[PDB]
Amino acid sequence: SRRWFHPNITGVEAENLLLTRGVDGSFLARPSKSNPGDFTLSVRRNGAVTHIKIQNTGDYYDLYGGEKFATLAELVQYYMEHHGQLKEKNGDVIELKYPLNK
Amino acid sequence: SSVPTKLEVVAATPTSLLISWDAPAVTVDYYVITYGETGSGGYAWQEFEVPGSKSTATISGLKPGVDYTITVYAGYYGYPTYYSSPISINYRT
16 A cells, blocks of 8 residues: 555666665555556566566556456455465566565 | 567657567567567567567657667467567667
8 A cells, every 4th residue: 555656757767766675575656657547566586677567457456367457456465375376477576575665 | 489589769850760579490470579668678668569470660759868678578379478588688769
């Protein structure tokens, strides 16, 4: 809820936050700048930053598949609790460990 | 290897650039391009998306005589849909 959502940053700003103020497993949510008005989950993993698309249909949030949520907070909580569901193309597990606040 | 290679400015004006890049070995679904003044750390940077079939893009509205950074990510569809492995270059208009 609230704190880990950063409304006024770009993708590069998000990376700099994660790469200088967070650790491996840190993440935040932010508005998509290339797909308005969707959302992006920027996650730091292995010294790099992966950006994940969140679909906002106006009725629910999801990741273009899987469970559908009323709010962003429910989506994030779900994917923190269900560790191991989110994977890269090679099979690398995307881990949502530490929300980066403010 | 999902990192795009050979990102270049192949045409330039004081206010605009035409960039080109070669596709990575792992075939891409889409690219994400971001750009902004070097040193600004991402403040007020612009970004847009193009499909994986496109390997060129035009960037406009640039200040003359200013250092810019240009970054291209590789994006994939799946569970989840994501983009990463960026490539960056610098260019002074």
